[PDB]
PDB file of C-alpha atoms and ligand atoms in Angstrom:
ATOM      1  CA  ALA A   1      43.569  20.366  27.750  1.00 13.10           C
ATOM      2  CA  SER A   2      44.141  22.826  25.620  1.00 14.25           C
ATOM      3  CA  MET A   3      47.433  21.098  24.097  1.00 15.53           C
ATOM      4  CA  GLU A   4      46.857  17.185  25.152  1.00 20.04           C
ATOM      5  CA  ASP A   5      43.386  16.842  23.796  1.00 18.76           C
ATOM      6  CA  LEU A   6      42.817  19.718  20.962  1.00 18.11           C
ATOM      7  CA  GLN A   7      46.111  19.529  19.325  1.00 18.50           C
ATOM      8  CA  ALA A   8      45.093  16.113  18.035  1.00 14.65           C
ATOM      9  CA  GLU A   9      41.663  17.482  16.223  1.00 14.32           C
ATOM     10  CA  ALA A  10      43.922  21.012  15.359  1.00 16.40           C
ATOM     11  CA  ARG A  11      45.695  19.208  13.246  1.00 19.63           C
ATOM     12  CA  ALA A  12      43.046  17.458  11.260  1.00 18.94           C
ATOM     13  CA  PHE A  13      41.742  21.628  10.426  1.00 17.02           C
ATOM     14  CA  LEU A  14      44.774  23.150  10.224  1.00 18.68           C
ATOM     15  CA  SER A  15      47.107  21.413   6.990  1.00 16.67           C
ATOM     16  CA  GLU A  16      51.033  20.929   7.413  1.00 18.34           C
ATOM     17  CA  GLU A  17      51.083  23.731   4.880  1.00 17.55           C
ATOM     18  CA  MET A  18      49.155  25.914   7.070  1.00 14.73           C
ATOM     19  CA  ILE A  19      51.557  24.869  10.004  1.00 17.34           C
ATOM     20  CA  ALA A  20      54.626  26.198   7.445  1.00 20.66           C
ATOM     21  CA  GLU A  21      53.378  29.248   8.250  1.00 19.84           C
ATOM     22  CA  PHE A  22      52.556  29.051  11.407  1.00 19.41           C
ATOM     23  CA  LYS A  23      56.290  28.412  12.708  1.00 20.48           C
ATOM     24  CA  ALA A  24      57.178  31.087  10.197  1.00 18.99           C
ATOM     25  CA  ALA A  25      55.453  33.902  12.863  1.00 18.30           C
ATOM     26  CA  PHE A  26      55.581  31.649  15.615  1.00 19.63           C
ATOM     27  CA  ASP A  27      59.701  30.910  15.531  1.00 17.77           C
ATOM     28  CA  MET A  28      60.424  34.664  15.628  1.00 18.68           C
ATOM     29  CA  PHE A  29      59.152  35.266  18.949  1.00 17.19           C
ATOM     30  CA  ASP A  30      60.729  31.499  19.989  1.00 16.63           C
ATOM     31  CA  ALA A  31      61.226  32.358  23.944  1.00 18.85           C
ATOM     32  CA  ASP A  32      62.925  29.006  25.206  1.00 22.88           C
ATOM     33  CA  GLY A  33      64.569  29.264  21.624  1.00 23.54           C
ATOM     34  CA  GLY A  34      63.103  25.716  20.983  1.00 22.94           C
ATOM     35  CA  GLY A  35      60.006  25.197  19.750  1.00 26.74           C
ATOM     36  CA  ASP A  36      58.143  27.711  22.946  1.00 29.70           C
ATOM     37  CA  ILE A  37      57.044  30.822  22.699  1.00 25.96           C
ATOM     38  CA  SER A  38      54.844  33.110  24.929  1.00 27.80           C
ATOM     39  CA  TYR A  39      51.220  33.287  24.486  1.00 27.99           C
ATOM     40  CA  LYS A  40      51.170  37.100  24.951  1.00 29.19           C
ATOM     41  CA  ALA A  41      53.553  37.206  21.819  1.00 25.46           C
ATOM     42  CA  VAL A  42      50.215  35.388  20.117  1.00 29.10           C
ATOM     43  CA  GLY A  43      49.257  39.618  19.790  1.00 30.65           C
ATOM     44  CA  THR A  44      51.279  39.649  16.905  1.00 31.36           C
ATOM     45  CA  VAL A  45      51.147  36.420  15.138  1.00 34.52           C
ATOM     46  CA  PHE A  46      47.416  36.658  15.244  1.00 33.30           C
ATOM     47  CA  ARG A  47      47.433  39.472  13.672  1.00 33.48           C
ATOM     48  CA  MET A  48      49.493  37.769  11.068  1.00 33.80           C
ATOM     49  CA  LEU A  49      47.425  35.478  10.637  1.00 36.57           C
ATOM     50  CA  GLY A  50      44.245  37.611  10.681  1.00 35.51           C
ATOM     51  CA  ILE A  51      43.371  35.802  14.029  1.00 36.26           C
ATOM     52  CA  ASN A  52      41.178  38.057  16.355  1.00 34.02           C
ATOM     53  CA  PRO A  53      42.699  38.237  20.044  1.00 35.28           C
ATOM     54  CA  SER A  54      39.425  38.108  21.796  1.00 34.51           C
ATOM     55  CA  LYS A  55      38.061  38.233  25.528  1.00 31.69           C
ATOM     56  CA  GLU A  56      37.101  34.197  25.165  1.00 30.66           C
ATOM     57  CA  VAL A  57      40.966  33.129  24.075  1.00 33.39           C
ATOM     58  CA  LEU A  58      42.551  35.400  27.168  1.00 35.51           C
ATOM     59  CA  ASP A  59      40.209  34.129  29.669  1.00 35.45           C
ATOM     60  CA  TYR A  60      41.182  30.421  27.955  1.00 35.21           C
ATOM     61  CA  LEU A  61      44.716  30.079  27.919  1.00 36.04           C
ATOM     62  CA  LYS A  62      45.023  30.361  31.462  1.00 31.96           C
ATOM     63  CA  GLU A  63      42.939  28.158  32.373  1.00 29.29           C
ATOM     64  CA  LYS A  64      42.470  25.551  29.885  1.00 29.43           C
ATOM     65  CA  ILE A  65      46.373  26.279  28.642  1.00 27.45           C
ATOM     66  CA  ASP A  66      48.346  26.978  31.121  1.00 28.48           C
ATOM     67  CA  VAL A  67      47.012  24.251  33.369  1.00 31.31           C
ATOM     68  CA  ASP A  68      49.832  22.626  32.662  1.00 37.61           C
ATOM     69  CA  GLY A  69      51.701  26.054  34.148  1.00 39.76           C
ATOM     70  CA  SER A  70      54.607  26.477  31.533  1.00 40.88           C
ATOM     71  CA  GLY A  71      54.146  29.796  31.544  1.00 44.23           C
ATOM     72  CA  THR A  72      54.464  29.790  27.713  1.00 45.18           C
ATOM     73  CA  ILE A  73      52.818  27.986  24.472  1.00 47.02           C
ATOM     74  CA  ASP A  74      54.427  24.995  23.215  1.00 47.32           C
ATOM     75  CA  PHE A  75      54.106  24.536  19.794  1.00 46.22           C
ATOM     76  CA  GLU A  76      51.525  22.074  20.435  1.00 49.99           C
ATOM     77  CA  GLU A  77      49.933  24.680  22.938  1.00 50.23           C
ATOM     78  CA  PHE A  78      50.045  27.312  20.368  1.00 49.86           C
ATOM     79  CA  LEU A  79      48.227  25.458  17.178  1.00 47.69           C
ATOM     80  CA  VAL A  80      45.137  24.987  19.434  1.00 46.17           C
ATOM     81  CA  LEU A  81      44.522  28.634  20.108  1.00 49.94           C
ATOM     82  CA  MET A  82      45.135  29.924  16.601  1.00 46.69           C
ATOM     83  CA  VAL A  83      42.699  26.876  15.087  1.00 47.95           C
ATOM     84  CA  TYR A  84      40.635  27.360  18.003  1.00 50.17           C
ATOM     85  CA  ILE A  85      39.008  30.932  17.249  1.00 50.43           C
ATOM     86  CA  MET A  86      39.775  30.479  13.635  1.00 49.51           C
ATOM     87  CA  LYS A  87      36.907  27.876  13.444  1.00 50.06           C
ATOM     88  CA  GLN A  88      34.703  29.957  14.376  1.00 49.60           C
ATOM     89  CA  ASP A  89      35.706  32.867  12.754  1.00 51.61           C
ATOM     90  CA  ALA A  90      33.448  34.081  10.301  1.00 53.35           C
TER      91      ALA A  90
HETATM   92 CA1   CA B 101      51.410  25.946  28.878  1.00 48.38          CA
END
């Protein structure tokens, strides 16, 4: 449900301007070459936006993101994990 339900609210928190830099860092790790990167790549991207790759997220991405079994994260799967931590990021 990480992508499906969560992307809906994600766009409410993250602005399109924010998405601009999100996709900038995301695009460099494009695995399928279209809108799709591996969730592990986040390690570098998370550093660019200043997000903390915590224990919860690593455990969360498998069951909530890749319940879909893509082995990767589409931009829709990606936006969620960023805003997920960022929303509570103090
Ligand atoms: Ca997936």
